[PDB]
């Protein structure tokens, strides 16, 4: 409207929010669909649907890929948001009773939920640097504001989904049996709106195009950089001064330097995968603690199950809180938040929040009576502080990663960094869902393990930047 | 593996709590289910209990209220039927499939490996 924001953005969280909306809206029945649709075990139906979590976190990775490499991105954009269309075709055609059965249902749903993790994958990184790109490099202080509405939206996006997700699926009769093909048939027309309103802007967007093969350039580049130096029984300047810098006589250095930026930030995010898993264990053992203490609150008859819900909406709070409040005053001083602090804070204050739920994991164990009713059994509440804290720390930590993974990232290869920070949120996954079995241990002392191992990896985080040489 | 049943005559609008106890391998790895074989009928599908109880499903007949628990401590299920009529006099047979990956329905006797002999309800 005024200036520094340009109209395009507009039709690039509206999309995104309307593209979580309709993700969310599926995943939450999924399992459902496998139980009481398909009628399959519960071991296929839990490995059916964490696999599929599993390739949708991995997949922005061949997203990436796809992107940068080769028809640019907005083609990308376009052509992955056309897949995942049909896969919610495909999907929602599986959960017909009326043609086929047993078979047509569920190679239809398999290759629905392959389609849609294809799909999800790709327009994950690709959405994000696309609007980043839509801001000039001079405007750095827009992107920040620009992502942190991005994160806001896919949020919001996700409070509404648990909000109105409930409705569809609650006593409707698609064809003599449970609608299971309006629950999927909804989150298909979010997602065709979303694509309608994404490419309703194609004349306003600032597509950059692709700088060339990047990414097999970059592989042939590091290739080249390892085999130099296997002078076995020679070698006089194998590669001095960096890893890279004799894989120079091919290469030039234009592509030297994108290369050591991305190996730079790799190894910057190295262990962020420790942290999204151990900051993941909070939605179900928090259940577990929620499920010992009172929730009456004198008001509202409050469930356990419901307080997930808390964490969506403190967001939607801390959010504009932070950016707009916060943030502001540490300016007034000479304080200087350089994206890389902001990080570290977090998981400060994600191990605080841990260790506060230890703390009251330790207070709901010392009960004593005086129906009998304990009169030291804690309320719902005092399970705000943690939340409070834990928010704060997801906020801080993956706004600034996003705008952090942008802004030191090669032009040439601007969204191939989104997809290591998705990259690494995706191992994240994939270690709690191998550590999940190994459970043998108290609450509060799982707890307190939890804590001090994400004081540990902050600790090396923090290590680790200090000694990161940003892009320049 | 070697479950067993427990069940007998009831009045036509009462109820039953039939019985399934295993007497081998861990009830923990098994997943359970109720089928019932109407004389001169084929088996049809009562209730399935998945491992740890934590997904029951119960047949779109579902006679009244029927509601499967239970306890893999000494290994025993349990079906509560509660208004029952006239119809449903078969005999109920309480099947067992080891936990494993299949695409097979859990609601089809194919699913189930192990069929153990059935009771005589009867109203």
């Known amino acids: 409207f005024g200036s520094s924001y340009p109209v395009s953005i507009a039709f690039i969280v509206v999309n995104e929010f309307c593209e979580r909306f309709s993700y969310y809206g599926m995943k939450a029945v999924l399992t459902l669909y496998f139980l009481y649709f398909l009628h399959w075990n519960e071991d296929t139906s839990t490995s059916v649907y964490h696999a599929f979590s599993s390739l949708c976190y991995f997949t922005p990775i061949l997203g990436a890929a796809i992107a940068d490499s080769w028809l640019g991105k907005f083609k990308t954009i376009i052509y992955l948001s056309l897949v995942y269309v049909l896969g919610h075709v495909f999907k929602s055609l599986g959960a017909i009773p009326i043609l086929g059965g047993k078979m047509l249902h569920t190679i239809l749903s398999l290759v629905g939920l392959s389609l849609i993790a294809l799909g999800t994958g790709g327009i994950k990184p690709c959405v994000a640097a696309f609007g980043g790109d839509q801001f000039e490099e001079e405007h750095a202080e827009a992107r920040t504001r620009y992502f942190s509405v991005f994160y806001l939206a896919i949020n919001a996006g996700s409070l509404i989904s648990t909000f109105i997700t409930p409705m569809l699926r609650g006593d409707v009769k698609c064809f003599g049996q449970d609608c299971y093909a309006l629950a999927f048939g909804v989150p298909g027309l979010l997602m065709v709106l979303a694509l309608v309103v994404f490419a309703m802007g194609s004349k306003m967007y600032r597509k950059p195009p692709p700088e060339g093969n990047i990414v097999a350039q970059v592989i042939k580049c590091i290739w080249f950089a390892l085999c130099n130096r296997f002078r076995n029984r020679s070698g006089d300047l194998p590669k001095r001064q960096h890893w890279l810098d004799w894989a120079a006589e091919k290469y030039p250095k234009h592509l030297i330097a994108d290369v050591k930026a991305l190996t730079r930030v790799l190894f910057l995010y190295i262990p962020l995968p420790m942290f999204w898993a151990l900051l993941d264990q909070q939605g179900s053992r928090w259940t577990l603690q929620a499920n010992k203490m009172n929730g009456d609150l004198g008001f509202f008859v409050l469930q356990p199950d419901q307080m997930q819900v808390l964490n969506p909406f403190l967001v939607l709070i801390f959010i504009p809180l932070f950016d707009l409040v916060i943030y502001r005053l540490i300016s007034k001083c000479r304080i200087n938040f350089s994206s890389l602090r902001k990080m570290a804070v977090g998981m400060i204050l994600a191990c605080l929040a841990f260790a506060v739920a230890a703390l009251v994991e330790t207070k709901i164990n010392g009960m004593i009576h005086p129906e009998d009713i304990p009169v030291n059994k804690l309320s719902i509440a005092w399970q705000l502080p943690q939340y409070v804290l834990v928010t704060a720390a997801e906020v801080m930590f993956s706004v600034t990663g996003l705008e952090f993974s942008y802004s030191q990232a090669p032009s040439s290869m601007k969204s191939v960094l989104q997809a290591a920070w998705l990259l690494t949120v995706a191992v994240g996954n994939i270690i709690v869902l191998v550590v999940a079995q190994f459970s043998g241990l108290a609450q509060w002392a799982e707890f307190v393990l939890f804590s001090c191992l994400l004081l540990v990896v902050c600790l090396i985080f923090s290590v680790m930047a200090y000694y990161y040489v940003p892009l320049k | 593996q070697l479950v067993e049943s427990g069940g007998g005559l009831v009045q036509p609008g009462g109820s039953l709590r039939l019985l399934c106890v295993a007497s081998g391998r861990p009830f923990n790895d098994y997943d359970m289910g109720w089928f019932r074989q109407a004389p001169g009928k084929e088996r049809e599908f009562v209730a399935s209990?998945?491992?740890?109880?934590?997904?029951?499903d119960y047949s779109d007949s579902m006679k009244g209220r029927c509601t499967v628990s239970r306890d893999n401590a000494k290994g025993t299920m349990f079906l509560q039927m509660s208004n029952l009529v006239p119809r449903d006099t078969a005999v109920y047979y309480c099947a067992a499939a080891r936990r494993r990956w299949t695409f097979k329905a859990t609601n089809t006797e194919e699913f189930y490996e192990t069929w153990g002999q059935g009771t005589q309800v009867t109203v």
């Open positions: 209990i998945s491992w740890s109880g934590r997904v029951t």
